[PDB]
Curated annotation (Swiss-Prot):
EC number assigned by the record: 3.2.1.60
Included range, full protein: 22 to 439 of 548
UniProt GO MF annotations: alpha-amylase activity; glucan 1,4-alpha-maltotetraohydrolase activity; metal ion binding; starch binding
Annotated protein name in UniProt: Glucan 1,4-alpha-maltotetraohydrolase
UniProt source species: Stutzerimonas stutzeri
Annotated active site: 190 (nucleophile), 216 (proton donor)
Note: There are several isoenzyme forms of this protein.
Length: 415
């Protein structure tokens, strides 16, 4: 495990990570209070599967509820107290210790934008009029106000002024706490549209400068004001700009949007297919998450922007063999049976020495997606839903079949 910063000081931790998203949306309903125990017991497996890092659920306790229903998942926490719906503080430490022990870094999901303000019994009480809240200032709309330099969450009445010295300080100390007592190797920043990118850089600088970080910025061009450059920019340029300011890798929503709206050939338009390595290397690719995808149980979870089952293998084949840093959804790996297939690809990625900044070229004369990836050990030829007949039609060298699945729809060759 190589550990540096990118040539632009982006905290990609050597560009060699392979992340497991360690939960699904309904864990709190399906394995109530038992999730950390399950992870502790799976640690050896996760490690054996080839993951270098795991994205843990929000550790901050959440006892919210709303009604079809939800609550307690962590995105509406009331405290920094770890005795929540995923398990106890003690179980968390054991889980973290087991994962860290098996060689898997622990990335914690953190939610700095808002908190369950109205929760009666909480350890954190910030009064109104004092400037701790967004709503302490005039709230025109879902736009920055003087009390909050980002967008608001729903109504914006739970929005924190993360720029308030005492609020900034509060998060900063919790981040240090997670690192010193909960074995945090990094953080996944939730709803980065809600506060300044610069703040993420400060928090990282202050608490875990050399760790891995990733921000989730899900906001399309049409969501910015008409006069904003972003209103007419590509998905790639919007997320790249955030990454440049936060100095953290960013979820590849450009690739997700093409997976959802374009054809397989169009997948070459995510951040990760960018010809500039300074662009590609900060991309954190995924297929689905707790939000966009399905989850076992209750109403199939959230499924806000789910990838159809007929493209699941193709999607994994693509992210596991290409530039950027890939993320595997718990469910595809461990619930739905794609595990064996994902394991082979992880092995293929590792054997070829594919990293965040590896070069990728797309070949125009065949159907589907055809790409050549220059891994540091080997060259891979990837043909998805293609008529390509032999790897030699697009690349020089001697190739062996590495993967052949879904009736030739997924094919990978190594040099
Ligand atoms: Ca690394
Ligand atoms: Ca906000």
């Amino acid at each position: 495990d190589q550990a540096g910063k990118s040539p632009n000081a982006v905290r990609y931790h050597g560009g060699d990570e392979i992340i497991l998203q360690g939960f699904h949306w309904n864990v709190v309903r399906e394995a109530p209070n038992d999730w950390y125990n399950i992870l502790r017991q799976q640690a050896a497996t996760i490690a054996a599967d080839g993951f270098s890092a795991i994205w843990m659920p929000v550790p901050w306790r959440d006892f919210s509820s709303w009604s079809k229903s939800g609550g307690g998942e962590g995105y509406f926490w009331h405290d920094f107290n770890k005795n929540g719906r995923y398990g106890s503080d003690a179980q968390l430490r054991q889980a973290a210790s087991a994962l860290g022990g098996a060689g898997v870094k622990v990335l914690y999901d953190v939610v700095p934008n808002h908190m369950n303000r109205g929760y009666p019994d909480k350890e954190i009480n910030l009064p109104a009029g004092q400037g701790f809240w967004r709503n302490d200032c005039a709230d025109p709309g879902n736009y920055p106000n003087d009390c909050d330099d980002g967008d608001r969450f729903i109504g914006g009445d739970a929005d924190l002024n993360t720029g308030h010295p005492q609020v900034y300080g509060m998060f900063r100390d919790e981040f240090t706490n997670l690192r010193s007592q909960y074995g945090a190797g990094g953080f996944r920043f939730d709803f980065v549209r809600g506060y300044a990118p610069e703040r993420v850089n400060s928090w990282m600088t202050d608490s875990a400068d050399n760790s891995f970080c990733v921000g989730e910025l899900w906001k399309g061009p049409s969501e910015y004001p008409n006069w904003d450059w972003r209103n007419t920019a590509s998905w790639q340029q919007i997320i790249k700009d955030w990454s440049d300011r936060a100095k953290c890798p960013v979820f590849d929503f450009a690739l997700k949007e093409r997976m959802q709206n374009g054809s397989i050939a169009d997948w070459k338009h995510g951040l990760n297919g960018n010809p500039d390595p300074r662009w590609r290397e900060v991309a954190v690719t995924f297929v689905d998450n707790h939000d966009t995808g399905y989850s076992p149980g209750q109403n199939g979870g959230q499924h806000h922007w789910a990838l159809q089952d007929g493209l699941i293998r193709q999607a994994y084949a693509y992210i596991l063999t290409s530039p950027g840093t890939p993320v595997v959804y718990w469910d595809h790996m461990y619930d739905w049976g794609y595990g064996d297939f994902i394991r082979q690809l992880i092995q293929v990625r590792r054997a070829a020495g594919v990293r965040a900044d590896s070069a990728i070229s797309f070949h125009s004369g065949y159907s589907g997606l055809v790409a050549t990836v220059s891994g540091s050990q080997q060259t891979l030829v990837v043909a998805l839903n293609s008529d390509l007949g032999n790897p030699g039609q697009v690349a020089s060298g001697s190739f062996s079949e590495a993967v052949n699945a879904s009736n030739g729809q997924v094919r990978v060759w190594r040099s």
